[PDB]
Design a protein around this ligand. Sequence first.
Ligand SMILES: Nc1nc2c(ncn2[C@@H]2O[C@H](COP(=O)(O)OP(=O)(O)OP(=O)(O)O)[C@@H](O)[C@H]2O)c(=O)[nH]1
Ligand SMILES: Nc1nc2c(ncn2[C@@H]2O[C@H](COP(=O)(O)OP(=O)(O)O)[C@@H](O)[C@H]2O)c(=O)[nH]1
Ligand SMILES: [Mg+2]
Lengths: 428, 161, 426, 22
Amino acid sequence: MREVISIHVGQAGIQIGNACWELFCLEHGIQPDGQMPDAFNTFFSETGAGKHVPRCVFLDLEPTVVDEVRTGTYRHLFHPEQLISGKEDAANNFARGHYTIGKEIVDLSLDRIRKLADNCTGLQGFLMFNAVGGGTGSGLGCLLLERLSVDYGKKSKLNFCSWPSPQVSTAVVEPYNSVLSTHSLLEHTDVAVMLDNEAIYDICRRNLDIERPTYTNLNRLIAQVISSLTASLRFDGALNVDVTEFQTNLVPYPRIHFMLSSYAPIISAEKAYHEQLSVAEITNSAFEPASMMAKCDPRHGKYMACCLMYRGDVVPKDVNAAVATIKTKRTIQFVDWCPTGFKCGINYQPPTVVPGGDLAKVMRAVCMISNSTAIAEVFSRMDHKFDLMYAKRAFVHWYVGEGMEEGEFSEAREDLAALEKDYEEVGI
Amino acid sequence: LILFPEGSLKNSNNTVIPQSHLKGKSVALYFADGADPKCASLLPFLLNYYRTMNEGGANQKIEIIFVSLDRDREAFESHRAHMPWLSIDLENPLTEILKRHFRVMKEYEVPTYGYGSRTGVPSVIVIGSDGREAQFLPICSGLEEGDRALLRWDWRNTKFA
Amino acid sequence: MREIVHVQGGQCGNQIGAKFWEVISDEHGIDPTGTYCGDSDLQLERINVFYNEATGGRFVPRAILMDLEPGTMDSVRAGPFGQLFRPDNFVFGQTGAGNNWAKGHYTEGAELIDSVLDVVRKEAEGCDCLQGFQITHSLGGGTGSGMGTLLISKVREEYPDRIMETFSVFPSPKVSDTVVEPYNATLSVHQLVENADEVQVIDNEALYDICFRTLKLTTPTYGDLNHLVSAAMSGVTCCLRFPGQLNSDLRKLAVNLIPFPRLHFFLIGFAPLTSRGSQQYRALSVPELTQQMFDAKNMMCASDPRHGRYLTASAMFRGRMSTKEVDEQMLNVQNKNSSYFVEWIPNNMKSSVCDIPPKGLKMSVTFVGNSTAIQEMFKRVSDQFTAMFRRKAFLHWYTGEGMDEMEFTEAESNMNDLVSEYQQYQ
Amino acid sequence: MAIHVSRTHREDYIRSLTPRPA
Ligand SMILES: Nc1nc2c(ncn2[C@@H]2O[C@H](COP(=O)(O)OP(=O)(O)OP(=O)(O)O)[C@@H](O)[C@H]2O)c(=O)[nH]1
Ligand SMILES: Nc1nc2c(ncn2[C@@H]2O[C@H](COP(=O)(O)OP(=O)(O)O)[C@@H](O)[C@H]2O)c(=O)[nH]1
Ligand SMILES: [Mg+2]
């Protein structure tokens, strides 16, 4: 029937989707050899008798994480050559992932999405998980995104990109990858959700009270967010909103499709014992700047669109009261031409818990996705940081000798600056 | 499954309780050694945690089943005397079978059984009804944080029903 | 009832027939010592089509094994299912055909004629009515090509109103064992066009290549090479021994395929051939088989039908499966492969629901197809002939046993007159 | 081309394991 297709590009896209697919198979209760001891139809295809196979592609040019999943616990969950591995990395470059080593792998991945989308009609969209910071994630990710944009023109693409952060980058050529990636990611994707790193790490410090988590807890939290976002697609509820009715609410102009998100409550076994979490206070914690996973303070921002999907037992009566409390709050600001900026979605099924994770199970939670004006300073920081190393040609000889031309750096300057001026002309 | 036989467990004043005497109670295996500087520093915080948590309530919340990896009976009783909660006698081979069932041993792996990882002394592990681990309290693990890991305890969903 | 008479010819024919008698035997559920095991009416009620009684309940196949060297026939008694055949059904050659068509057909094979007729007529007239024959032989060597085509040149004019299907193993463009390639290939084929009812082309070079992507294994032995052939060997004649909603037999298969008497060379292929990694991950259904058997890359012959054009196609589906899902799904492949099919024949395909699935598999299909794509494989054999015949090379061994330069030039002239209709039926 | 033991990941390692273990 009606289905959705996932794509994972880059190493960050790999084990983020590993955290996603373990949680999807945990929610449906399916034992991950395929057997169950029709709501799974959109994320899993039936194979034979009782077996279910994920509808996703794994894609990274090194085999160090692709063969890790292949030899790992889900060898019999993921189909073996749904996973595509290359031979050499993109070496933290847009250029290698887009020009030379991308040819040998996009022809196979295009064959895999044709075999995965021609099986049934009624496709909702695509779920691309990638990293802007990844050389393969931005390199091979952008070549994949533009090819699926021209071929699949009128289909939507939910994107989840690991944006670089102000303090850490864990790459010296990192802002070079960031400017060029959004140079073409602006015009080909339909919607992209922005996820920084130590905003989530500070989330794990503050309200999850753990002082040294790893990429485990970075990927558990991203898996909760996408699952509560797509919870209306698989599971039935009181007020269901689907993929095609997200851009109509959150995207007022086709230029602006970059936005923040947060999930509440972020609690452990110490908090579910001690604090009551009602509808009027979980939305206040969701609108707290501490829960922001892009470390952007919205007080000097301005909200313009928000979808408040609640997962778990809630009623329309008390969620409308919680909406009215946020509107009457003086510190939070809205834009004057959007009197209605809250589009609440309601599900019924309780949020799941991964056994062994720090999260304690909660049966009402808020995922909220919010287009605002505050994104401008996050990207203008990225523009200023790039300009210092573009002053006297830092790390440009790798790109030039690869096959791109000096001037694609400069064209990406006024396209990100056009995105800067677009943010400040809607913030008036 | 009958994980603990009739003469298995050993509480204070040197009396015996079988497995049945622990229903509705959050049971945990403390694997400890007398000579480990980990356990010497970690035991007072278990003494404070077990005492205060249990005192704060109208029910008995947690038990601690002590399993010993010491050298002889004299070192067994010396570390036993500083400790009020449950335990198992060392010479009973029941200590050995749940030592290999939970991978908590003391770096003699290849002379005996030679499987892999040991995750040895110290560890406290809450367990379910059928001898299955319920969660790992991360004292020395990938989280490797001692002396405060008892706060991860989840005493409503880990019952010995 | 309807009797099919099987012949193993040459080293390749003996080895490929051994695997087919292994896959038919366990398809009918038969222990290799002769005793039937498996407890079903539906695999035993039609057993006389291929087999014969032995007044003990034992079943012996209607197969004669004929070969001019004793080497590879000693291997098939030594191998599994070697006790299944009749000892009289073997006929021996103690000399060994040394890759020469001349001693295959004229000189050394002449003294084995009086023994091979006496064993094929003995098996034929013992039944009430014969249906057809089915031989397996290769055009590469001498005892398969020359000694095998000598069988077609005699069995037809003594049993005129019958048919036979010859599964000819054809040589390679790239790899080359049996260094005298074009002489044995051409000398067999000009007889084979005139005097054989249909020819299935089987290509080793290509069937390594199915074994390198869709079955993708690194170490291909001759065992599973022949096992992939024996699937389409079995599927082309499955409804002779099995019931079905829409039936098919060999005589029908000829009537609605061959339009003109001088084209009867057919592609062959078996679907599904699912990779070992992909075994559990295919909820196998009719749409994905149809694209697999209308897939050029999955053809046992080393000819690409993208260049060619299917004159008539045929598909014997097998198993519990819907019948209109055969019908309008092939109307979909006509409407999408409009240029891949001949425009002066509408509805170019067979549909045939063999109601019995293959051995272990729920449902499958066997594709046989008259294609004009074989013209490129027939012309490279032609220029392989001419490149070595201008220099008169490797001719002294042939001429010493009663050849002629004249008889070689109607072999090439019948070769060119065989190719000739293919590019003007495009 | 160098061919290695089936317990290393080079070319198609997945079913250098399953039909013919080494
Ligand atoms: N959210 C999240 N991001 C990650 C994780 N692991 C790596 N990343 C991000 O990935 C970015 C760089 O990509 P890599 O992890 O090095 O690997 P890659 O995506 O294949 O790209 P290459 O570096 O060219 O190999 C870093 O900036 C990180 O922010 C993770 O577990 N979670
Ligand atoms: N399919 C298959 N082909 C074979 C086999 N053995 C040999 N061949 C092919 O047959 C050719 C040699 O012809 P062969 O039949 O052995 O010569 P003959 O003994 O004189 O008939 C070689 O090019 C091989 O590719 C086999 O067991 N199976
Ligand atoms: Mg990578």
